[PDB]
C-alpha cells in the first residue's frame, strides 16, 4: 500500500533526509583545478552562473528516482539538434527528472566503440510546449545505483531507487512500534466496577444516561487525597494495572536496524551525541566523511568532467577534491605556520629560488595573499 | 534422477514439476474460474476462443492461476488466458470422499470434478485435500484423451 | 503505413499494465450590484476520467 | 484533523523553537567581501540601511509558509513595472508573505534561457491599496525546501512548510504523554468504604449530604499521625496502590523522536547539558555549525548576490562567511601571536615587502590598528 | 516452478536476492569500490602528469567497479578490451600500446571454443579461443586468448572446480545466506511479542446463544469495540458482577536486544567485515580503538587487493605505456590529514637536507628524492 | 564425519580457518641479501607471477596435508631425467594430494637419499596419460606433524586441520543457534479450552470453519483490542517463560572455537573488544608472531626451492620482512631517526661516504638514491 516514492519522500521526514543528506553535502564540500593560470576570475564565472542548486536537485533526484537528465545550452549558431563543435561557452542549466527523457536513435555500427550506445534523446518537459530532439552531447544522464544486468536490461537502462523494500518496511515498522507504546501507557491501570441487577437496564434511556453521567462524574472526582463509598451488599469497585519496562530498548533496536540497513550512522540520522567518550565521534564523523568520498568518487566527477571542458579554454587540467574536514581557526593557523617553516627552513642553500618558492607558498591555500609578481 | 514436488497448493495452480504444457494464446468468453474446466469454442487467427465447461462438451485443459494477467480474482471477458494441456493441477470438486486411484474422472456443469466413474478421459492422481467448507483433487491431463465427437 | 501516418508516443513504462487521463469542466454566472451587496453567484468546478489497455 | 501551521506556530513554543532557531543565529554570524577597497565606509552604509530585522523575518517566513518576497525601491526615475538600469542605488527593503504575490506575465522565448521562468510579478498587499505589478529584477523570492516536481508545478512552483505531518503528529503526542502520566500520577492511591445498606439512602437529599460531608470531614484529617474508626459488623475500610516506574525513560524516548524528526540535536532543541562529559559537546556544537553552514549555502547567499551589486559600485567581489566558531579571547591572542611571527619570521630575506606585509597582517582580522599608509 | 518465458531462467534467484535484500547489496559493495577508489602509482615512468590525464580521459573506473563486483557476486566475470589495429578481431595481437574501448560482461555470456593440449609450451590446459554470446540481437563472436581476461572470485577445491568450468562461486554461501534470513524472522518475531503485551478478555453468560452474521451479534460486538476505544487511565467500566466478568492479563519482555544484538554478531563474524563498517554503529566505550578497528580492516582488504586487483594492472597497462620496465605500488590506505601530514612534511623536509650538506648527496638528485614522496611543494623541472 | 571438501565449501567458519593464514602468510613479502641488485629481481618476480599458484598450494597443503608442484625448465632433454646446474624456469603447476604417487624407491648405502622415493607418478587425469617425473622438478609440500606410525600408514603424508574435535565444535554451533531460534519462537503461547468441541467429525466444513474462525480472531487480538467468549463453555487462557543467559551461554561456544581453532578473536570473530584502547595492537603482534613461526617452518622450503632456480649468483640470504603494519607518520620518525643515527658522528670516523650510502640505502628508504660514487 505504502510504496509510492513520491508521497512517502514528502510526507516521512526520515525519508527526506535520508535521501537528500548526502548529495547537498556532497556539493557544499568544493574542489579546485590545477593547470589553470587563475582562480579568482574561475570563481567569478562559477558564482556568476550560479548552478549549485540545480546541481543539488538534480544529484537529489537521481538518487531517488533512480535516474535524471541536465541540460546544458551553449553559445552557438547551430540548431539544438545538431551536435556541439569545440568551445568554452555556457549560457544555462535545466535538470529533469526520470519522466521526461526517451530514446530516438541507435548508433550499432561496427568501427565506433560506441554502438549500441544512445545517440538522440528525447525530451518531453511538457508544460504545454513541443518536445524535441536533443543530440548525445548536449545532455548529460545521472544514474542511482548498479543493477543485474538483467534488470538494467529491463528498466531501459536506468537505475532503482535508493528506497528498496527492506528500507521500506524497516521505516513502517517503527510507526507501528510507536503507536503501540502509546496504546501500551494508555492501558496502564484499569478500573471497574460491579453492580448487580446493572444489567437490568433498558437500552439508551433516561437512566442509563444518568449511570453513565454519574459514573463519569465520580471518577473525575478521586485521587490520592479523595475516597469513594459503595455500598457492600450489591457492588464493589476493583483496579487493575500492568508494568512497563523493556520499551525504550526496543525503540533504540528498531531505530538501530533502520542506521544498519540505511548506511548512515547516528551522530548523523538519530542526531544524539553518544556522550560517553570524549573524543570517538570526530572518528565517526571521518568515519562518515570517507564513505562519503568513495561514493562521491562515482557520481560527482562525471558532471565535472562533463561541464568543465565547456567553460575553461585552457588545454590540460586536473581536479581534486578538498578533503573534507572541519577547519578551526586556530589549527588552521597553525598548519600555516608549519607549513611556512616547512617551505623555507632550508631552502636557502640549494637553488630552490623565490620563483618556486611564492608558487609553493600560495599553492596550499593560505590565510595569506600575494601580489603575482617576481 | 527424480521430479520436484511444488508446495503451495491452492486451487488452480500447477501441483508437480513433471511434463506439462501451458497454452497462452487463448482469450476468454464470459467469466471463469480459477480451477475450472475450459472447452474450445472457436478459433481466430491461430487464437482459441474459451468458456467455461456447459453441458454435452469435451474439455480441453483447466484454468491456470497468475498473479499478473488476472489482478482481479478470476477470469475476465476479453481477457488472454493461460490453459494447462498436459500436467497435473489441482481442481475443484463437489465430491465427498476421495475416489480410487487412478480412476476415470467425469466434470459436471461449469467444470467440476463430480464423477469417478468415466470411461475415458483424466484421470485422478491421490491429491485430496480440503478448501473452504468444498475440497480439492489433483487431476492428471493429458493431450489427447478426450477426442471431440463427431 | 500505420507508424508513419499516425503519430507514436512513449508515455508509458514497459511494465505498465492500464493507463488513465481526465478531463475537466466549469460553471458560472455574473451579475450587475451596487455598493452594498451582500449576495453574489459562485462558481465550481467538476472532473471525469477514461482508461485503456 | 488538519489544522492550519499558523495557529500552531504562534501557539506553541517548541514550534517556535524548530521554525526559529536557525535563521536568526544564521544571519546574525556575519559575513566578509572581498575585493572592495575598504570595508568601514561598507559596515557603516549596512549599518545605516539596518535591514536585518527584515531580512530576519523574511527568512522566518520562506522556512515557515515556504514562501516570502521582498521589494526593493531604487532612486530611479521610472514606473515600477521597468526593468532597471545599471547602477548603484538602494532606498528601502519591505518584506510580504506567501500569500500576497502572484504571477502575471509569461515568457517562452527560445532565444533566452528565461524561457519557464516569471516575467512580472503581481503584488496584492491589500490594506486598501490597489494591488500592483514589479518588474522581475526588483523582487527577489525566498522559497522553502526542495519538493517533488510533481508537487512543485501542482504549488505554483513554490516550497512546503517545514513542519510536516510526521512533525506536527509527533509534537501533539508527547503534550498527550504528558498529560497521562499526570494522570497516572494522580491515580497513585485509592481509598474504599463500604457501608451496607449504603444503597438504601435516596438520592440528592439532606442524609445524603450529611454523608459525604462527613466523608469529606473525616478524609482531610486522615494521615500519618492521625486514625480513623471503623464499625466492625457493617463497613469496612480498604485502600489500593499501584506503582510508577519507566515513565521519565518513555518521554525520554518520546523527546528522542522528536529530535530524530527535527534534525537539531539535544543541547540545542532541549538545551540540556549532558553533563557526564566535558568536552564532547564542543564537538556537538561543530556538527551544528556544519550542519547550519550547509543549509546557510544553500539560501542565504542568493540575498547576498540579490542585493550587494544594487549598492556597491565596484565592478567585481566575492562573499566569504565568516568561520561559524565561538571565539575565546585567550585563544585568540595565542593565534595572532602565531599569525605575527608567521607573517615575519622568514619574509627578511626575500622580497616579500613591507607593503604588503602589511595587508596580509590587516587582512587576517587582528586587534593591530593600523593606519593606511605605504 | 513456472515462469514467464521472457524472464529466462537464469539465477534470478539469488539475484532478486541481490536486488532486493539491502544486507546483500552492502557486503557484495563494500570491498571492490574502495578497492579500486584507494589508487595506485607508478614508479619507473619518465613523468606521471600526462599519465593520470590519459588515465582519466580514458576514464574507465565504472566499468572496473562492476566488472570486480559482479566477479565476486556470480563467481566469474569477462572484460574486452578492442584496440586500435588494422586487424581481425580474432588473431592475436602484435607489439604495441593502443586502447580505444573497453566493456565487460557477466558470467553467463561466455564459453571456451578452442582449447590447448600442447606439449612444448607451458600454455597447454588453458582455454584459447573465447566464444562470447552477449546476446541483444547480435551475432556471437569469438575472441583471442591474449584479447581479454577472466576475472574470478575465491579459490574452491579442484574437485568443484573442474566441474564449475574453471570458475569460482558466489560470495554467498549457504551459511551467509541462512544466517541473513533469519534475522528478519527474529524481527518479525520480536514484532509479534511487543504486539501481545496486553490482553483483554470479557465473559457473559449465555453469549453463546447468538446466531453468526446477525444483527444482534453485530451490535454487540459494535458496542466492545466502542468501550474498548474509550477506556483508559482517567476512564472506568461498569459491568454487571452476577453475569459478566472483565479480566486483563499481561506478559513481560526482556533479553530481545540483546537477542538481536546476539544475531547480529552471528552475521558479522561469519562476514568477516566488522561492526564498525556493516552495522555502522561505533562502539562509543572507548575513545582511540576504532582507529585500530580500522587498520584491521585495512590490512584485510589490502590482502584481499594483492589477490585480484594487481592482475588488472598487468592485463592493461602493457597495453597502454610507451617504456619498458615499470613498478606497480600501491598507495599505503590510510587517510591522512592537516595536521599529521604538515607536520609530516615538516620532518620529511628537515630529514631530506638536515646532514647531506657534507657528503656528496647532492641537489639534481635531491628535489627529485624530496619530491618522490608526494608532496603539497609543487616544483618546476629543471636542473 | 563427511568428507572434508564438502564441508570446506559450505561453512564459512572452515573456509577463515583453513584460508586466513596461507593468504597472509604468502602477501607479507620478504628481501633478499647477498645479491647485485633487486629491481630486476622484483621485475623478474611480477613477471613469472606465480602467487596465485603458491597461495592455494599452501592452502590445500594444509586442508587436505599433502601437496605438489611441478617445475618446468628450458633443459633440452626429456623430462624424466635429471636437470644440469642452471637458473631457468617456464611454468610451474600445483596439484593435491590424490594425484601424486611414488614409483621407485631408493635405499643405496652410500648415498644419504636413501629411505625416500626417486621417482613420482603424477596422474593428473584429463584424459592424458600419467607420467613419471624425477624427484629433482618435485617439491612436497605438508601439512602438520603427525605420529611416524600414522605417517608411514598415511604414505609418508601428513594429515588435516580440519580434526574431529575441530569438525564437531564447530558442528554443533549451528544447533545451538537453532534451538536459540526455537527458545524464542516459544515464548509465549495461547490456549482455548471449548467443551464439546471433541463430537466434531475429522476434516469437515464444521472443523474448518471453527480453525477458520480461531486464526481470524487471533490474528487481530492485541493490546488496544478485546475478545469476548462464553462464560460457561470455553475458557481463553496464557502462558509465558523467560530467556536468558542464551547470549553468553552462544559466546561461551564461540570462546571455545576460537581456544581450539587456535586463532583469536580480533581475527576469527572480527570484534573489536571495545574496553580497552591499546591492547588490540598486542592481540595483533601475538597474531603475527604465530604466524611467522608457522611461515619460518612450511614457506621458506619453497623459497630455496625455487630461488636457485631463477638466480645465477652464488651465495645468498632470504630474510623475512619484519611482519608489522607500517604507517606514514610513524615511519617519518623512523627515517629522520635512521638518517641521524648514520651521520651525526660517522664525521671523525673512517666509515666513508661509499659505504655510508650503502648503510642508508639498505634499509629501505622513502628517500631514493641514484647508484653512484
Same mark, same amino acid.
Given at each position: 500500500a +505504502?510504496?509510492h516514492?513520491?508521497?512517502?519522500?514528502?510526507d516521512?521526514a526520515?525519508?527526506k533526509?535520508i535521501?537528500?543528506?548526502?548529495?547537498?553535502?556532497?556539493?557544499?564540500?568544493?574542489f579546485k583545478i590545477?593547470g589553470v593560470?587563475?582562480?579568482?576570475?574561475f570563481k567569478?564565472?562559477?558564482?556568476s552562473?550560479?548552478?549549485?542548486?540545480?546541481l543539488?536537485?538534480?544529484l537529489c533526484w537521481?538518487?531517488?528516482?533512480?535516474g535524471?537528465?541536465?541540460?546544458?545550452?551553449?553559445?552557438?549558431?547551430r540548431?539544438? *539538434?545538431?551536435?556541439?563543435?569545440?568551445? %568554452?561557452k555556457?549560457?544555462?542549466?535545466?535538470?529533469?527528472?526520470?519522466? !521526461?527523457i526517451?530514446?530516438?536513435?541507435?548508433v550499432?555500427?561496427?568501427?565506433?566503440?560506441?554502438?549500441?550506445?544512445?545517440?538522440?534523446?528525447?525530451?518531453?518537459?511538457?508544460?504545454?510546449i513541443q518536445?524535441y530532439?536533443?543530440?548525445? *552531447?548536449?545532455?548529460?544522464?545521472?544514474?542511482?545505483?548498479?543493477?543485474?544486468?538483467?534488470?538494467?536490461?529491463?528498466?531501459?537502462?536506468?537505475?532503482?531507487s535508493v528506497?528498496? #523494500?527492506?528500507? /521500506?518496511?524497516?521505516?513502517?515498522?517503527?510507526?507501528?512500534?510507536? +503507536?503501540? !507504546?502509546?496504546?501500551?501507557?494508555?492501558?496502564?491501570?484499569?478500573?471497574?466496577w460491579?453492580?448487580?441487577?446493572?444489567?437490568e437496564?433498558?437500552?439508551?434511556?433516561? %437512566?442509563?444516561?444518568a449511570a453513565?453521567?454519574?459514573?463519569?462524574?465520580?471518577?473525575?472526582?478521586?485521587?490520592?487525597?479523595?475516597a469513594?463509598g459503595i455500598?457492600?451488599? *450489591?457492588?464493589?469497585?476493583?483496579?487493575?494495572?500492568s508494568?512497563?519496562?523493556?520499551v525504550?530498548?526496543?525503540?533504540?533496536? #528498531?531505530?538501530?536496524? /533502520?542506521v544498519?540497513?540505511?548506511?548512515?550512522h547516528?551522530?548523523? /540520522? #538519530?542526531?544524539k551525541?553518544?556522550?560517553?567518550?570524549?573524543?570517538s565521534?570526530?572518528?565517526a564523523?571521518?568515519?562518515?566523511?570517507k564513505?562519503?568520498d568513495?561514493?562521491?568518487?562515482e557520481?560527482?566527477?562525471?558532471?565535472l568532467?562533463?561541464?568543465?571542458?565547456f567553460i575553461?579554454?585552457?588545454?590540460?587540467?586536473?581536479?581534486?577534491?578538498?578533503?573534507?574536514?572541519?577547519?578551526?581557526? #586556530?589549527?588552521?593557523?597553525? /598548519?600555516?605556520?608549519?607549513?611556512?617553516e616547512?617551505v623555507?627552513?632550508?631552502?636557502?642553500?640549494?637553488?630552490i629560488?623565490?620563483?618556486e618558492?611564492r608558487? *609553493?607558498?600560495?599553492?596550499?591555500?593560505?590565510?595569506?595573499?600575494?601580489?603575482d609578481?617576481? | 534422477?527424480?521430479?520436484?514436488f511444488?508446495?503451495p497448493?491452492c486451487p488452480?495452480?500447477?501441483?508437480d514439476?513433471?511434463?506439462?504444457?501451458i497454452d497462452? $494464446?487463448?482469450?476468454?468468453q464470459?467469466?471463469?474460474?480459477?480451477?475450472?474446466?475450459?472447452?474450445?469454442?472457436?478459433?481466430?487467427?491461430?487464437?482459441?476462443?474459451?468458456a $467455461? =465447461?456447459?453441458?454435452?462438451?469435451?474439455?480441453?485443459?483447466?484454468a491456470?492461476?497468475?498473479?499478473?494477467?488476472?489482478?482481479?480474482?478470476?477470469?475476465?471477458?476479453?481477457?488472454?488466458?493461460?490453459?494447462?494441456?498436459?500436467?497435473?493441477v489441482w481442481? =475443484?470438486?463437489?465430491?465427498?470422499?476421495?475416489?480410487?486411484l487412478?480412476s476415470?474422472?467425469?466434470?459436471?456443469?461449469?467444470?467440476?470434478?463430480?464423477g469417478g466413474?468415466?470411461?475415458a478421459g483424466?484421470?485422478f492422481a491421490?491429491?485430496?485435500?480440503?478448501?473452504?467448507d468444498?475440497?480439492?483433487?489433483?487431476?492428471?491431463?493429458?493431450?489427447?484423451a478426450?477426442? $471431440?465427437?463427431? | 503505413?500505420?507508424?508513419?501516418?499516425?503519430?507514436?508516443?512513449?508515455?508509458?513504462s514497459?511494465?505498465?499494465?492500464?493507463?488513465?487521463?481526465?478531463?475537466?469542466?466549469?460553471?458560472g454566472?455574473?451579475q450587475?450590484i451596487?455598493?452594498?451587496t451582500d449576495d453574489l453567484?459562485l462558481?465550481?468546478?467538476?472532473?471525469?476520467?477514461?482508461?485503456?489497455k
Amino acid at each position: 500500500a +505504502s510504496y509510492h516514492v513520491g508521497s512517502f519522500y514528502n510526507d516521512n521526514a526520515t525519508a527526506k533526509r535520508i535521501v537528500d543528506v548526502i548529495p547537498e553535502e556532497m556539493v557544499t564540500a568544493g574542489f579546485k583545478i590545477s593547470g589553470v593560470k587563475d582562480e579568482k576570475e574561475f570563481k567569478s564565472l562559477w558564482d556568476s552562473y550560479k548552478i549549485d542548486p540545480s546541481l543539488v536537485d538534480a544529484l537529489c533526484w537521481a538518487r531517488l528516482y533512480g535516474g535524471a537528465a541536465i541540460v546544458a545550452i551553449i553559445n552557438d549558431n547551430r540548431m539544438l *539538434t545538431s551536435p556541439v563543435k569545440p568551445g %568554452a561557452k555556457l549560457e544555462g542549466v535545466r535538470v529533469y527528472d526520470r519522466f !521526461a527523457i526517451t530514446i530516438e536513435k541507435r548508433v550499432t555500427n561496427a568501427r565506433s566503440p560506441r554502438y549500441g550506445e544512445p545517440e538522440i534523446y528525447k525530451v518531453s518537459p511538457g508544460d504545454n510546449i513541443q518536445p524535441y530532439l536533443i543530440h548525445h *552531447t548536449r545532455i548529460f544522464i545521472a544514474d542511482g545505483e548498479r543493477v543485474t544486468p538483467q534488470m538494467r536490461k529491463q528498466n531501459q537502462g536506468w537505475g532503482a531507487s535508493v528506497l528498496n #523494500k527492506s528500507l /521500506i518496511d524497516a521505516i513502517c515498522d517503527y510507526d507501528y512500534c510507536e +503507536s503501540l !507504546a502509546t496504546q501500551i501507557l494508555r492501558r496502564k491501570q484499569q478500573a471497574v466496577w460491579k453492580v448487580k441487577g446493572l444489567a437490568e437496564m433498558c437500552d439508551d434511556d433516561d %437512566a442509563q444516561y444518568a449511570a453513565r453521567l454519574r459514573l463519569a462524574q465520580v471518577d473525575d472526582n478521586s485521587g490520592v487525597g479523595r475516597a469513594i463509598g459503595i455500598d457492600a451488599e *450489591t457492588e464493589e469497585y476493583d483496579v487493575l494495572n500492568s508494568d512497563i519496562s523493556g520499551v525504550p530498548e526496543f525503540l533504540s533496536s #528498531k531505530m538501530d536496524r /533502520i542506521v544498519s540497513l540505511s548506511g548512515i550512522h547516528e551522530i548523523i /540520522i #538519530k542526531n544524539k551525541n553518544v556522550g560517553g567518550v570524549s573524543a570517538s565521534q570526530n572518528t565517526a564523523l571521518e568515519t562518515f566523511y570517507k564513505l562519503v568520498d568513495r561514493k562521491r568518487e562515482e557520481d560527482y566527477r562525471p558532471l565535472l568532467e562533463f561541464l568543465l571542458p565547456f567553460i575553461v579554454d585552457e588545454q590540460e587540467w586536473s581536479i581534486e577534491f578538498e578533503p573534507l574536514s572541519v577547519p578551526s581557526k #586556530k589549527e588552521e593557523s597553525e /598548519i600555516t605556520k608549519n607549513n611556512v617553516e616547512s617551505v623555507t627552513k632550508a631552502i636557502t642553500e640549494q637553488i630552490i629560488d623565490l620563483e618556486e618558492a611564492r608558487d *609553493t607558498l600560495r599553492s596550499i591555500a593560505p590565510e595569506f595573499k600575494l601580489k603575482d609578481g617576481n | 534422477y527424480e521430479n520436484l514436488f511444488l508446495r503451495p497448493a491452492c486451487p488452480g495452480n500447477i501441483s508437480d514439476t513433471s511434463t506439462y504444457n501451458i497454452d497462452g $494464446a487463448c482469450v476468454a468468453q464470459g467469466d471463469i474460474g480459477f480451477g475450472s474446466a475450459v472447452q474450445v469454442v472457436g478459433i481466430v487467427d491461430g487464437v482459441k476462443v474459451v468458456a $467455461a =465447461l456447459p453441458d454435452g462438451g469435451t474439455p480441453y485443459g483447466i484454468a491456470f492461476r497468475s498473479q499478473y494477467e488476472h489482478l482481479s480474482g478470476k477470469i475476465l471477458d476479453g481477457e488472454v488466458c493461460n490453459v494447462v494441456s498436459h500436467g497435473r493441477v489441482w481442481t =475443484l470438486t463437489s465430491l465427498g470422499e476421495a475416489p480410487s486411484l487412478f480412476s476415470k474422472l467425469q466434470f459436471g456443469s461449469g467444470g467440476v470434478v463430480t464423477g469417478g466413474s468415466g470411461s475415458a478421459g483424466w484421470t485422478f492422481a491421490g491429491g485430496f485435500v480440503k478448501h473452504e467448507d468444498g475440497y480439492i483433487i489433483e487431476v492428471q491431463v493429458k493431450q489427447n484423451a478426450f477426442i $471431440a465427437p463427431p | 503505413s500505420a507508424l508513419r501516418v499516425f503519430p507514436v508516443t512513449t508515455e508509458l513504462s514497459p511494465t505498465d499494465k492500464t493507463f488513465e487521463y481526465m478531463t475537466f469542466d466549469k460553471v458560472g454566472t455574473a451579475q450587475i450590484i451596487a455598493d452594498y451587496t451582500d449576495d453574489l453567484p459562485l462558481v465550481d468546478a467538476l472532473g471525469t476520467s477514461e482508461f485503456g489497455k
